[PDB]
Nucleic acid binder design. Structure first.
Lengths: 234, 49, 51, 124, 64, 180, 304, 133, 66, 175, 171, 52
RNA sequence: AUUAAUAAAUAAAUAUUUAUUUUUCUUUGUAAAUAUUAUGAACAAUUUAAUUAACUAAAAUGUUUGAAUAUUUAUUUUUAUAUU
C-alpha cells in the first residue's frame, strides 16, 4: 500500500497487477530468495511487504525528503468535493436545474454519473474528513454542504444516492485489512453530517463593523437555506 | 556426443560401460565370427543338395 | 478418513481434452469446429530437429 | 486448517459462460460441487467475464492471496490446484532443510549452557 | 505457455482483484444452482437450442 | 495414565517423576523429530486430510524434566498425537544442470512436498520390570531409593604424579540423592 | 470415536479372508468374530465398516454350516443398509449376492433368484459403467515406441479387477442362471444370461477406443498432458451430449442474443447503434457511399 | 498407540534375565574365522547383528512399522513404495524357495555330485583331497 | 545447576569470591530461576543504570523521577 | 539452445552494479551461480553439514567424558537408532537425555537380544483331523493376534482374551 | 547484495586495527565465555597448541556453530617449560617472507624461543586456527586474541579464577 | 600439504618409494641458500648421491 | 571393420525404422531394410602360454642393535573404535 494508492487517494491501483505498464516485468526489485525466480510468493504478507516497500514513491506517495501535502486538511478536502461536483455537472446544467422533470437523456446520465462519482469520492475521503472534523472551519463545513447540494446528492439526515448501500453479498466483499473500505457508508455519512452540523453550531456560538455584520448576515442566510435544502435544521 | 542416461544410484555414475556384462568390441567380433562359423558348419553338415 | 486429493505432477500437469476421432465418430454433435476437424492421428506434425 | 478452522476464506474463479476454453466450465459442472460439499466454509466467487482471467485465486484468513494459472489446464488440474489452495495456509515459504524441519526451537528439560556439567568431573 | 514449464505458474498474485464486481458476480449456492455455461463435456462452442436452434423434427438424441 | 510395575515402592516412587511437560524423539518419513506438546514440524508428505487428528507410532525416545526413557530401537506405551495443519510444498530448490561441451541445459524445480503437523499431546504409560544396575548388567530384586544403586568415588590416588589436578571441590564433591 | 487398534483388527480380517479363500471356514468365522466385535465397538451405528464385516461374518457362518445364523446376519445387514444414507453400490450388491447364496443354501431357490435379479436391477439403475475406465481408456496413446516396449500400446485393465460391482453382479447372474437350469426354467435363464451379456457389452463399449499414432514417435513428450485427461467416456458422452443435456446460457452475461431476445443483452450505461461495422467505411467517399443504406436495412431486418 | 516390533509375529527373545543372574552379552569381536586380527564390531556390523540391513532405513522396524496412524486407530494407506517393498520381500522369499526347490530336484534326479567341488576348483585348491577311484 | 552452584560456592569460600566467580554464580542463579528466554544483552541494563553509579555534580544531577 | 533467460532475469535484482544493470552480465552470473550451487549441494553440502553435526556430538561426548568414536560404536551395540542430527539436537536441547544415553552406553547393561526367527508351533505338526472344530495352530495364531490387539493400547474391547476369542458366538444365533 | 567497502582499516591508518575482545558484532558473544588455565610444563608444544585451540575456537562446546565466534579464554602459563620431543628444538624450521626479492626468513624454534617463547606458542596456535578456519580474516584472528600467553607462572588474570584445564593424551 | 614447520620439504615426495622416504643426511636450509638451490642431500647409495 | 580383378557363407562401426515368445539352474542385444564412414603411430620385447547427479536425510575409503656408545672387548630402551 506504500507505493500505490493509500488512505485518501482517489486513484484505484492493484499493486500486484501490473496495470499501467508498457513492458512485461523482467526484473523484480523486491526479491528475498533466488527461488522467487519461479515462485515469487506474491500475495503472502511478508514478501508482498518487501516488494511494495521496494517500489519507488509514485505521485500519490511522497519521498522522505520531498515536502508532502496536507491532504488530511478539511479546508482542502471540502474544495476537492466542490471541484468534483463542478466538473461532474457543468455550470449551464447547474443553472438549468436550479431554475427548474424535462431533461435530455444525455443530461440525465451526466447527472447520474456525477452523483456516482461524488459518492465514490466521499467514500474515499471519509477517513480523512473524520480525522479532520476536530480542527475544521465553519466556512469549510458550509462548503461541504454547498458541495453536496451542487453534486445534487441529499445527505442522509434521517435525488438520494447515499441512503442505499452498494449491492454485493457479504461473503464476497473485500474484507482484507489495510484497505480503507467503508462498508457502512450511509451510517458513516450520516454520522459525519450530524458531527458537522454540531461543529457549525459550536463555531457560531464561539463567534457570538459593517463588513463583519454583512458576513454574519450572509453566513446565517446561507446556513439556513443550505440546511433547509438538505433537510436539516439549526 | 556421449549418450547420457538417467541414473538410479551413484553406482551408475561410477559406471563407464553401459552394459558391463557385454564383451568388448573385439571379443564381440570374435564371438560373432565363431557363432557364424558354427552355424555355417551345421548347415553344411549334410552334403550340397 | 478419505485420502487427501494432493496434486501430483502426472495428474495435475494436464491439458484440456480436445475431441479425438473416436469421440467425434461416437457423438457427431461435438464436431463443432474446423479445430475439431483434425487430421489422421498418424500425422505427428511438421518435423522438428535434425536427423 | 488450524485449530479446526480453515485458513482459506474465499476462492475466486473467473470464467466465460460461453465461447472460451471449456476447462473452467467443465470443472464448474463436474468437480466444483464435490469441493463445495467437502469445504462448505470456503466461499466460492464465480465471476462471469467476456475475457476471463484463466486463473483461480484464493484469499486466506490473513488477507493474503494465492493465484494459480489455468490457461489450458484440465478440469482435474484445476480441481487439484483448488485443493492445494485449501490445504496451504499461505503464511510461510521456508525450505525443507534439516535446520528448518522444526519451526520453533524448544527445550523441555532445558537448553545447554556453559555452566551445565561444567563443575562435574571424572570419577572412578 | 507450456503446462510443465515454471513460467506457467511463476505468477502467483495480482491476476484477480479480490474485490468482486457489484453487477454480475455471484456465489455458488450449491449443486442445485444451475451455472451458466457449465457442462460436463469440453464444449468449445457451448451452444443450445435457444442460441442456434436446429430445424428438424427431433433434437438429435443418441436414442435416434 | 501412568507408570506401572509389580513393585509398589518403585511404582509410587517413579509415578511423580512422570508428571509434567514431556518431549519425544519420533521417527517419521525417514527423519527424526524432537517434539513437545506445542511444537510444529514439517514432515515429508503424508497422505492425510488436513485437520486430521493423527498419531505417531514409532517413537525412539521419551523424556521430561525428571526422567528419560530410551527405545532400543523403539518404545511402547507412548501416545504422541498431533494435528495435520497443512499439506503444502516447501520452498523450491532450483537445480540447473549444464555442461560447457554440449548445448543442453536442464532446469529442475524441486518444491519438496511436505505436511505441517502440530503436536497436540504426549503421554507415556511405561511398564517397568525392576531396578537395573549400571556397572553390572544384573537387575536388582530390591529397589532402595535411599541408596545409590551405583556409588561413585574420586579419581585422585597420589600414584599419578603428573596428573592434571583440578580444584579440590570439583575433584571431590559428593552428589545428593534424587529420590528423597 | 474410541481408540481401537484398527491396524491389528485389519490384520485379523485379512487373515480371515485368507482362511475363507483357503477353505478354513471355521477359522475365518473365528477371526471375523473378533473383527466384528472391534468394528461394532469402534464405529457408530449403521456404519459401512460394520455392515461390511457383518456381511463377511454371515458368509463365514453360511460356509461353516450355520445357515440360520448367516440368514439372520445378512437380514440385519440389509436392515442397516436401509437405515444408512448413501450406501455403497458395491456393498449393497455384495450384500444381495450373499443373501442370494444363503437362500440357495437354505433351499429357497426362487428367493435367491429374486435377490440376484434385484441386485441386477439396482446396479443397472444406479451404476456408471464407464467410470471405472475413465482414466484407463486413453492409456494406449501414451506409448511412443512400436518396435520395442509396445506392451504399453496394448495395456489392458480388466473390468473384473477395476470394477468390483461388475464382478459381483456377474457372479450373482451366473448363480441365478445355474439355479434356473437346476429348476428347469428356460425363460428366466435366457433373460438373466442376456442381461449378463448386455452388462459385459456395456463395460467393453465404455472401454473401447481407436488407435492414435501407431509407429514409433520421437520426442513430443509434452503430449502426455493431452493423452491423460478427463476424457469423457462413451456413456457420459451419450448421456450429456450437447443437445440432450443443453447448456444453460444466461444472456445477462453475453453480448450477442437471438433476434427476438435482443433486449436481454448485457446492460449498457447509454449505448447507441452506429452501423454494422463495415470495414470498407475507412476507404473513401465512394466506398462509404456504396454502403449508406446497409444500416437502415439491417435495422428493418431486426425491427421489433 | 506406539509400536515396537522386531519380528513379524511380534515375539522377542528374553531381553532381561532373572534377577541376580549374569546377563548374556553379544560377541563384540567380528565374525572373522581367524583368531587374528582381533577386531571389534563396527557400527554397521552391529546394525546387521540387530537386524537392520547395515543402514537404519533399509530393514527392521524403521522400515516395516507405519510412520503414522489416525488418533482413533485407523491405519495408514498402502503407498506405492510400500507395495514395492512388500513385493521385494516376497521376491526374496521366492528366490529362496526356488533355490531350495532346485536343490531338492537335483538331489532327487541324482545330479548333485558326491565330489566336493568342480573340476576347476579341485585342480586349483590342494585342500580338496583326491577322489580318484 | 544447583549442584554446580553449590560446588562453585564450596570452591570459592576458602579463597574469597572473585569477580568472575560472582558473575558465574549470578548467571547460574538466573538460569535456575528463569521461566523464559533472555534475548537482551546483560550488560545493557548496567549501561543504562550507570547513572546510579557515576555521580554528576550541580543541579544537572539525575535522580529518580525528574 | 535453451538458457534460463526469463527465469533468471527475474532474480537479476539480487546482483550488484554491472550484473544488475546489464541483462547479459546478470544472466551469465546467475547461470553460473545456479550451476555452482547445484554442484555444491550435490557433492559437498551434505559432507560439511554432517561434519558439523559430528563435531557437535563429539564435543558433547567429550564434555561427558566420552567421544564420538566410542559413542557411535556403543549406540550401534545398544541398538539405539538416533541419527547424528537427532543426537546433536538432544545434546543441545536435552542435555539430561543425552547424558542418560551416554550413561546407558557406558553401563554394562546387556544390549537387546537379536530378533527372533519365526517358530513353527507344535500344533502345525499335530494331525488334523485326528482320524465343526478349528485347527489348533490356527487357534494359537488367533490367540496371539488377539493378545497383540489387546496389548497395542488401552482399547475398550476388554482384557478378556477368552471373551474376545469367543466373539463369534455373540453373533451366532441358536437354531 | 552485501557490499564490503574498499576503504578498509589498514595497519598504516591512524584509526588502527581492532581487538575482537572489545568489539561488538552479531557474531561475537562473550556472555557464555569461560576462563581456563593451561600449565604447559613438560607438555609437547604441538599438543599444547592443539588442546588450547580446541577451547579457544569454541569447538569444545556442543552449541558450536562455525559462523558464530564464541570460545573460552585460555591462559597458557609456563610456556618457557614447554617441551619438544627430541632434536626438534633446532631441527624444526619456521619460515616467513617479505615482498622483497631476498625476503625469505628461515629460523629455528631455538631462535623463536630466545626471542619470545610466547611468540612460538602463538605461531602454533595460529597454525591450528588456520588449519580449521582460513577463509575469513575475522575467524582467523578472533580466537587468537581470545588466547592468552605467558612464559612465566605469573599472569594478571587472577581476578577471573581461570580453572585449570585438564585433558588426556591420545596414548 | 602444509608449511615447513609441519611438513619438511623432503617429505613432499613421500608417495614415491626408495631413499626419498628416509630422512636426508645433510640439510642446507638453515645456514644459507646454495646457488644450485639444493636443500637436502641423502646418504650416498654407492657412487650415486641424491639431492633435492 | 579392412582379401582390388573368374564357380569363396558373412565388412564392421554409428544412426533411423523394423523383425523372431524354440525346451536346459541362472543369465544373455540376435536379425533385417536404409543413411554415413581416412582423425590417420615408428622401434624393441614376448608369444603354437601369461565429467555424468530430482529434493531431504543416511552413508563403511584410511630418527642404534650384520648398528650405536665406550676402552686396549664390555655395554644400550630391537589390537580396536572412528573419519566421503
Amino acid at each position: 500500500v506504500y507505493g500505490g494508492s493509500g488512505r485518501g487517494d482517489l486513484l484505484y491501483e492493484n499493486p500486484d497487477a501490473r496495470r499501467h505498464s508498457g513492458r512485461a516485468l523482467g526484473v523484480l526489485n523486491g526479491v528475498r530468495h533466488s527461488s522467487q525466480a519461479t515462485m515469487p510468493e506474491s500475495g503472502q504478507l511478508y514478501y508482498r511487504k518487501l516488494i511494495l516497500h521496494s517500489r519507488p514513491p509514485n505521485g500519490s506517495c511522497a519521498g522522505l525528503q520531498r515536502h508532502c501535502h496536507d491532504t488530511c486538511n478539511w479546508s482542502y478536502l471540502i474544495p476537492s468535493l466542490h471541484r468534483c461536483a463542478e466538473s461532474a455537472i457543468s455550470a449551464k446544467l447547474w443553472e438549468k436545474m436550479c431554475q427548474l422533470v424535462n431533461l435530455t437523456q444525455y443530461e440525465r446520465q451526466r447527472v447520474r454519473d456525477g452523483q456516482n462519482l461524488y459518492r465514490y469520492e466521499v467514500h474515499q475521503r471519509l477517513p480523512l474528513l473524520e480525522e479532520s472534523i476536530g480542527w475544521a472551519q465553519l466556512d469549510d463545513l458550509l462548503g461541504w454542504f454547498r458541495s453536496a447540494r451542487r453534486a445534487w446528492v441529499r445527505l442522509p439526515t434521517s435525488s438520494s444516492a447515499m441512503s442505499c448501500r452498494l449491492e454485493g453479498h457479504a461473503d464476497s466483499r473485500d474484507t482484507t485489512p489495510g484497505r480503507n473500505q467503508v462498508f457502512d457508508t450511509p451510517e458513516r455519512v450520516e454520522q459525519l453530517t450530524e458531527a458537522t452540523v454540531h461543529r457549525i453550531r459550536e463555531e457560531l456560538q464561539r463567534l457570538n463593523s459593517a463588513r463583519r455584520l454583512a458576513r454574519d448576515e450572509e453566513l446565517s442566510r446561507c446556513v439556513e437555506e443550505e440546511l433547509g435544502w438538505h433537510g436539516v435544521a439549526l | 556426443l556421449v549418450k547420457r542416461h538417467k541414473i538410479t544410484n551413484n553406482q551408475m555414475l561410477l559406471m563407464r560401460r553401459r552394459e558391463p556384462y557385454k564383451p568388448t568390441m573385439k571379443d564381440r567380433q570374435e564371438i560373432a565370427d565363431r557363432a557364424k562359423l558354427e552355424e555355417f558348419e551345421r548347415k553344411n553338415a549334410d552334403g550340397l543338395m | 478418513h478419505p485420502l487427501p486429493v494432493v496434486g501430483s505432477r502426472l495428474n495435475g500437469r494436464t491439458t484440456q481434452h480436445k475431441w479425438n476421432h473416436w469421440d467425434q465418430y461416437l457423438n457427431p454433435q461435438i464436431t463443432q469446429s474446423i479445430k475439431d476437424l483434425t487430421p489422421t492421428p498418424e500425422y505427428v506434425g511438421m518435423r522438428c530437429g535434425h536427423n | 486448517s488450524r485449530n479446526g478452522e480453515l485458513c482459506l476464506k474465499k476462492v475466486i474463479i473467473s470464467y466465460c459462460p460461453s465461447n472460451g476454453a471449456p476447462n473452467t466450465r467443465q470443472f464448474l459442472a463436474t468437480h466444483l460441487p464435490h469441493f463445495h460439499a467437502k469445504y462448505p466454509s470456503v466461499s466460492i466467487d464465480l465471476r462471469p467475464r467476456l475475457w476471463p482471467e484463466m486463473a483461480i485465486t484464493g484469499v486466506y484468513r490473513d488477507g493474503s492471496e494465492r493465484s494459480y494459472n489455468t490457461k489450458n489446464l484440465s478440469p482435474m488440474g484445476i480441481f487439484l490446484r483448488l485443493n492445494n489452495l485449501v490445504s496451504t495456509a499461505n503464511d510461510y515459504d521456508q525450505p525443507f532443510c534439516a535446520s528448518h524441519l522444526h519451526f520453533q526451537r524448544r527445550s523441555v528439560q532445558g537448553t545447554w549452557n556453559p555452566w551445565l556439567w561444567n563443575y562435574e568431573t571424572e570419577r572412578r | 505457455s507450456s503446462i510443465f514449464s515454471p513460467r506457467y505458474d511463476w505468477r502467483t498474485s495480482g491476476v484477480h482483484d479480490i474485490a468482486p464486481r457489484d453487477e454480475g458476480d455471484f456465489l455458488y449456492q450449491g449443486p442445485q444452482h444451475v451455472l451458466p455455461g457449465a457442462h460436463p463435456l469440453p464444449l468449445h462452442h457451448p451452444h443450445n437450442t435457444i442460441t442456434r436452434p436446429v430445424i428438424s423434427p427431433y433434437i438429435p438424441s443418441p436414442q435416434r | 495414565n501412568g507408570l506401572r510395575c509389580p513393585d509398589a515402592l518403585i511404582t509410587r516412587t517413579l509415578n511423580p517423576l512422570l508428571n509434567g511437560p514431556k518431549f519425544a524423539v519420533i521417527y517419521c518419513g525417514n527423519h527424526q523429530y524432537k517434539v513437545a506438546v506445542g511444537d510444529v514440524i514439517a514432515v515429508q508428505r503424508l497422505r492425510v486430510e488436513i485437520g486430521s487428528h493423527i498419531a505417531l507410532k514409532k517413537v525412539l525416545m521419551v523424556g521430561g524434566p525428571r526422567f528419560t526413557a530410551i527405545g532400543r530401537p523403539l518404545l511402547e506405551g507412548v501416545r504422541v498425537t498431533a494435528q495435520v495443519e497443512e499439506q503444502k510444498r516447501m520452498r523450491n530448490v532450483v537445480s540447473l544442470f549444464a555442461t560447457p561441451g554440449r548445448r543442453h541445459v536442464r532446469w529442475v524445480d524441486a518444491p519438496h512436498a511436505a505436511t505441517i503437523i502440530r503436536i497436540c499431546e504426549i503421554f507415556y504409560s511405561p511398564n517397568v520390570v525392576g531396578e537395573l544396575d549400571k556397572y553390572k548388567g544384573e537387575l536388582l530384586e530390591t529397589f532402595t531409593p535411599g541408596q545409590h544403586t551405583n556409588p561413585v568415588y574420586p579419581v585422585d590416588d597420589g600414584y599419578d604424579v603428573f596428573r592434571k589436578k583440578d580444584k579440590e571441590a570439583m575433584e571431590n564433591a559428593t552428589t545428593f540423592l534424587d529420590l528423597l | 470415536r474410541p481408540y481401537v487398534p484398527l491396524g491389528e483388527v485389519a490384520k485379523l480380517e485379512l487373515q480371515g479372508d485368507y482362511y475363507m479363500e483357503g477353505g478354513m471356514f471355521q477359522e475365518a468365522l473365528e477371526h471375523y468374530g473378533v473383527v466384528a466385535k472391534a468394528y461394532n465397538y469402534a464405529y457408530p451405528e449403521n456404519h459401512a465398516q460394520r455392515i461390511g464385516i457383518r456381511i463377511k461374518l454371515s458368509a463365514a457362518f453360511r460356509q461353516t454350516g450355520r445357515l440360520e445364523s448367516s440368514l439372520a446376519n445378512i437380514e440385519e445387514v440389509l436392515r442397516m443398509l436401509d437405515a444408512s444414507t448413501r450406501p455403497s453400490l458395491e456393498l449393497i450388491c455384495e450384500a444381495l449376492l450373499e443373501l442370494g447364496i444363503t437362500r440357495e443354501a437354505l433351499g429357497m431357490k426362487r428367493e435367491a433368484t429374486e435377490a440376484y435379479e434385484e441386485a441386477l436391477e439396482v446396479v443397472n439403475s444406479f451404476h456408471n459403467w464407464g467410470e471405472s475406465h475413465r482414466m484407463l481408456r486413453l492409456l494406449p496413446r501414451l506409448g511412443r515406441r512400436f518396435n520395442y516396449n509396445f506392451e504399453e500400446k496394448f495395456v489392458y485393465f480388466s473390468p473384473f479387477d477395476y470394477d468390483r460391482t461388475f464382478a459381483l453382479v456377474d457372479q450373482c447372474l451366473e448363480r441365478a442362471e445355474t439355479i434356473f437350469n437346476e429348476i428347469g426354467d428356460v425363460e428366466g435363464a435366457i433373460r438373466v444370461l442376456q442381461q449378463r451379456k448386455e452388462m459385459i457389452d456395456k463395460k467393453f463399449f465404455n472401454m473401447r477406443d481407436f488407435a492414435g499414432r501407431i509407429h514409433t514417435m520421437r520426442g513430443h513428450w509434452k503430449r502426455r498432458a493431452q493423452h491423460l485427461t478427463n476424457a469423457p467416456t462413451p456413456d457420459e458422452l451419450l448421456r450429456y451430449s450437447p443437445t440432450i443435456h443443453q447448456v444453460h446460457r444466461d444472456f445477462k452475461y453475453e453480448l450477442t442474443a437471438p433476434i427476438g431476445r435482443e433486449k436481454e443483452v448485457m446492460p449498457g450505461v447509454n449505448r447507441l447503434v452506429l452501423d454494422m461495422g463495415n470495414p470498407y467505411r475507412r476507404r473513401g467517399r465512394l466506398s462509404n457511399k456504396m454502403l449508406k443504406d446497409a444500416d437502415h436495412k439491417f435495422a428493418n431486418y431486426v425491427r421489433q | 498407540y506406539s509400536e515396537a516390533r522386531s519380528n513379524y509375529d511380534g515375539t522377542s527373545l528374553p531381553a532381561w534375565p532373572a534377577p541376580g543372574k549374569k546377563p548374556t552379552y553379544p560377541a563384540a569381536l567380528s565374525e572373522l574365522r581367524l583368531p587374528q586380527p582381533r577386531m571389534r564390531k563396527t557400527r554397521t556390523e552391529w546394525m546387521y547383528y540387530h537386524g537392520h540391513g547395515g543402514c537404519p532405513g533399509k530393514y527392521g522396524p524403521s522400515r516395516e512399522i507405519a510412520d503414522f496412524e489416525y488418533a482413533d486407530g485407523t491405519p495408514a494407506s498402502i503407498s506405492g513404495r510400500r507395495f514395492a517393498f512388500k513385493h521385494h520381500q516376497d521376491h526374496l522369499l521366492v528366490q529362496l524357495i526356488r533355490a531350495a526347490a532346485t536343490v531338492e530336484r537335483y538331489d532327487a534326479s541324482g545330479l548333485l555330485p558326491r565330489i566336493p567341488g568342480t573340476a576347476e576348483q579341485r585342480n586349483w585348491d590342494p585342500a580338496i583331497p583326491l577322489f580318484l577311484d | 545447576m544447583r549442584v554446580g552452584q553449590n560446588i562453585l560456592a564450596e570452591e570459592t569460600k576458602a579463597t574469597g569470591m572473585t569477580s568472575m566467580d560472582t558473575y558465574v554464580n549470578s548467571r547460574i542463579q538466573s538460569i535456575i530461576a528463569e521461566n523464559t528466554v533472555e534475548n537482551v544483552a546483560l550488560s545493557h541494563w548496567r549501561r543504562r543504570h550507570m547513572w546510579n553509579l557515576v555521580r554528576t555534580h550541580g543541579k544537572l544531577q539525575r535522580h529518580w523521577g525528574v | 539452445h535453451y538458457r534460463a533467460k526469463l527465469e533468471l532475469d527475474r532474480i537479476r535484482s539480487m546482483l550488484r552494479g554491472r550484473a544488475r544493470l546489464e541483462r547479459k552480465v546478470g544472466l551469465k552470473r546467475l547461470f553460473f551461480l545456479m550451476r555452482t550451487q547445484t554442484r555444491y549441494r550435490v557433492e559437498q553440502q551434505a559432507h560439511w553439514e554432517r561434519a558439523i553435526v559430528r563435531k557437535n556430538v563429539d564435543s558433547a561426548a567429550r564434555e561427558h567424558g566420552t567421544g564420538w568414536q566410542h559413542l557411535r560404536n556403543e549406540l550401534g551395540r545398544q541398538n539405539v537408532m538416533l541419527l547424528p542430527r537427532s543426537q546433536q539436537l538432544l545434546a543441545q536441547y536435552e542435555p539430561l537425555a543425552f547424558r542418560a544415553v551416554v550413561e546407558l552406553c557406558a553401563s554394562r547393561i546387556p544390549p537387546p537380544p537379536p530378533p527372533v526367527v519365526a517358530s513353527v508351533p507344535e500344533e502345525s505338526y499335530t494331525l488334523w483331523p485326528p482320524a465343526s472344530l478349528s485347527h489348533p495352530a490356527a487357534r494359537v495364531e488367533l490367540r496371539c493376534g488377539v493378545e497383540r490387539v489387546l496389548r497395542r493400547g488401552p482399547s475398550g474391547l476388554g482384557n478378556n482374551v477368552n471373551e474376545l476369542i469367543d466373539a463369534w458366538k455373540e453373533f451366532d444365533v441358536s437354531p | 547484495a552485501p557490499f564490503k567497502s574498499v576503504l578498509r582499516r589498514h595497519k598504516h591508518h591512524p584509526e588502527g586495527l581492532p581487538l575482537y575482545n572489545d568489539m561488538s558484532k552479531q557474531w561475537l558473544c562473550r556472555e557464555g565465555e569461560r576462563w581456563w588455565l593451561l600449565d604447559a610444563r613438560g607438555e609437547q608444544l604441538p599438543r599444547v597448541a592443539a588442546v588450547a585451540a580446541q577451547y579457544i575456537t569454541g569447538q569444545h562446546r556442543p552449541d558450536f556453530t562455525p559462523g558464530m565466534i564464541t570460545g573460552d579464554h585460555v591462559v597458557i602459563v609456563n610456556i618457557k617449560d614447554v617441551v619438544m620431543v627430541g632434536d626438534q628444538w633446532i631441527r624444526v624450521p619456521i619460515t616467513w617472507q617479505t615482498a622483497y626479492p631476498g625476503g625469505k626468513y628461515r629460523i629455528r624454534l631455538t631462535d623463536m624461543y630466545e626471542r619470545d617463547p610466547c611468540m612460538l606458542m602463538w605461531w602454533f596456535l595460529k597454525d591450528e586456527v588456520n588449519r580449521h578456519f582460513v577463509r575469513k580474516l575475522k575467524t582467523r584472528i578472533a580466537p587468537l586474541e581470545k588466547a592468552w600467553l605467558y612464559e612465566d607462572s605469573i599472569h594478571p588474570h587472577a581476578d577471573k579464577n581461570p580453572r585449570p584445564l585438564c585433558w588426556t593424551d591420545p596414548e | 600439504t602444509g608449511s615447513p614447520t609441519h611438513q619438511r620439504e623432503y617429505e613432499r615426495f613421500h608417495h614415491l618409494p626408495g631413499d626419498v622416504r628416509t630422512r636426508p643426511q645433510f640439510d642446507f636450509t638453515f645456514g644459507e641458500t646454495r646457488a644450485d638451490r639444493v636443500m637436502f642431500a641423502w646418504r650416498k647409495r654407492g657412487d650415486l648421491q641424491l639431492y633435492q
